[PDB]
Amino acid sequence: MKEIKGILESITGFSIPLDNGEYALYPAGRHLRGAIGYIAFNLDLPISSKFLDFDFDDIIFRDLLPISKCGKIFYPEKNSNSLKCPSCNEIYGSSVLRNIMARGLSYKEVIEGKKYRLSIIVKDEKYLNEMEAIIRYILSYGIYLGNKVSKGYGKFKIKEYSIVDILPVKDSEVLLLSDAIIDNGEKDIVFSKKEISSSKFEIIRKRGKAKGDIIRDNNHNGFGEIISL
Amino acid sequence: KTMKKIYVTMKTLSPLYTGEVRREDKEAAQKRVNFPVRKTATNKVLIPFKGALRSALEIMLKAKGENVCDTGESRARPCGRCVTCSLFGSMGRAGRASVDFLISNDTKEQIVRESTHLRIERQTKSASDTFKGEEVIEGATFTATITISNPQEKDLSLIQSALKFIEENGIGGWLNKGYGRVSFEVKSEDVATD
Amino acid sequence: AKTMKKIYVTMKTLSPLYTGEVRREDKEAAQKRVNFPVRKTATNKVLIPFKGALRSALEIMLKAKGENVCDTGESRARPCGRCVTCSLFGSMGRAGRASVDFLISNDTKEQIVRESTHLRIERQTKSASDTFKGEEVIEGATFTATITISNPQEKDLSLIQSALKFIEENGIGGWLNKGYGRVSFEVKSEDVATDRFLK
Ligand SMILES: [Zn+2]
Ligand SMILES: [Zn+2]
Ligand SMILES: [Zn+2]
């Protein structure tokens, strides 16, 4: 097991809508998965076939959680929309969003300059050979996460491709960094599969668990995530 | 497989204006300038580039003879059959070209100036209304990177044709009064293996 | 529709020419030396607004005929959208057919811009009461612009030439009453296909 670390920053702003006209503050790992699968199909890579597999259970993408001037990731504030890093507060929040009115199109973005965590957890080392190639393409051109990729919104640039290994969590009690798939969890989560080869945009809805919640689970390996805490 | 990459550097030849889309930053700037220029929060100027390339190929190919889908119309909903919808987008499948914003190489303090624009009466020959609009100086180098996946043979030539149509009509806003005339320098690259 | 009328306009200055700098920072930098800087590029070439001069010329002349052109020059006055001037240069909700470029000089500011002393002389004493340095453009300075008419109509070119003949009589730019801005326009028009670049 290993992971590729990164201080992924935004060249142009990203627009990710949620339900209830909510715009997400930071970019999520689902968006990274959806973009990297387009990369692997576009470069005729084999893992693209696994990219259209939503339960491959290797190459799991952790959320692009924002990084602070404290050098640490903003830990998500428990049961709250905004985030707060363990060192100081520096609290992210909505102020970073801007209401956009552009040619009829009224939407929102999140501004550029803030840095976000790259963390691609990979299990199979055979997949790491293609993983080095896809992080090496982004290294040259960039990745686009958001809406209006063809208009140019969402351009991301890595500044630190680091393939440093890691180990899973220890405590059973873990904090939910990202929203987790837990049935009858009363926190509705929506994403989609596009399947551009065969069309049929999906808009898959679910009722998983929300982020910022301490939960005890001995059967935990750590799209939810496990914070060691 | 081999996706087509077009590095488009743009040099501003007459002052550029593109209005700012974000309401909060536009409201913040409205104090100093009635018309703020479109700016990033990294203090750099971004320009929309997809729509101008699209509308260039729309009017050129429409009057050429190849029937296309007039976008920017009353309804503006496009087909999935004509050439522009195979390049710059369709109501169903994604467009084959990803057109990045023309980000600037320089910063706000080095290219962006506030200016007195005017409205003069035709009998008293004196200024009736004055307003303060922001522009980008001439000789300012912007950059963008077009991404045409599934490359057809008439792709780079069509993009260059559209850029010539943009070099003569202009990019941005206030296009009829002389704002927006630029030059485009173009380089191309296919990428195969990484 | 299938054509565009491109009017290449080359204008020579028969008089000293002044158009003021609009840019706050450039004007503020120049007021350390000259109280009236001229409007230049960062390429260091003189820019003149051209669309508003043509529009003003055609509104005064077409209102002098008796045609129902509106006036887009008063405070709060809106374009009506039905005139020939509203068709040629624009309306609120209807983009103009003429893409009038800026009058960009052929030479640079060292060649054609001169810092000039202007005065205010007291009438009774016949002595200088105010002095101010201001930049002006020399005579014989050549400027080029292109007026690109989209959806070309019959009258347009002649209308543009008529508007140019107004600007040849009155002037373009600032200090027009003092003698500044007297110019001479030469027209070289060409009807061209709008699909010229597709090849
Ligand atoms: Zn902090
Ligand atoms: Zn179409
Ligand atoms: Zn009118």
**Which amino acid is it at C196?**
R
Nearest residue of chain A to residue B151 (CA atoms): A42
On chain B, the residues whose CB falls within 8 A of the CB of A103 are 51
Give the CA distances from residue B12 to residues B139, B142, B146, C107, C196, in Å, rounded to whole numbers and listed in that order: 5, 8, 19, 18, 23
Cβ contacts of residue C144 below 8 Å, gap of 6+?
C8, C9, C10, C11, C103, C104, C106
Instruction: Please tell me the distance from the alpha carbon of residue B118 to that of residue B105, in angstroms, as a whole number.
Output: 30
Q: How many angstroms separate the CA atoms of A187 and C185, rounded?
A: 72
Token code pair at residue B107 = 């910063």
Ligand nearest the Cα of residue C84 is 3
- Resolution of the solved structure (Å): 2.8
Task: In whole angstroms, give the CA distance from residue C141 to residue C74.
Answer: 32
Gap from B194 CA to chain C (nearest CA, Å) = 34
- Spacing, Cα C174 to ligand 3 middle (Å): 26
Q: Reduced to 3 states, what is the DSSP secondary structure of residue B5? A: strand
Technique employed here was cryo-EM
Would you say C79 and C117 are in contact if contact means Cβ atoms under 8 Å apart?
no
Chain B: list its partners (3+ Cβ pairs within 8 Å): A, C
Q: Phi and psi at residue B178, in whole multiples of 5°? A: 110, -10
Which residues lie near ion ligand 2 (Cβ < 5 Å)?
A: B 69, 78-79, 82, 85
Q: Check contact B-A (3+ Cβ pairs < 8 Å).
A: yes
**A95: which DSSP letter?**
G
- Reduced to 3 states (helix: H, G, I; strand: E, B; else coil), residue B44 is coil
Contact residues, chain C, for B59 at CB < 8 Å = 194
Rounded Cα gap, residues C114 and A208, in angstroms: 74
Q: Is the Cβ–Cβ distance between A116 and A66 less than 8 Å? A: yes
Burial C19-50 (b: 16+ CB within 10 A, else e): bbbbbbebbeebeeebebbbbbbbbebbbbbb
- DSSP type of residue C36: B
Task: List CB contacts (< 8 A) between C102 and chain B.
Answer: 14-15, 178-179, 181
> What is the three-state SS of C147-188?
EEEECCCCCHHHHHHHHHHHHHHCCCCECHHHCCCCEEEEEE
H helix or E strand, kind and range, residue B51: helix B50-64
C-beta of residue C34 within 8 angstroms of C-beta of residue C198: no
Contact C47 B177 (CB under 8 A): no
- Cβ distance of A152 and B99 shorter than 8 Å: yes
Q: Which among B25, B48, B149 has the least Cβ separation from residue A151?
A: B48
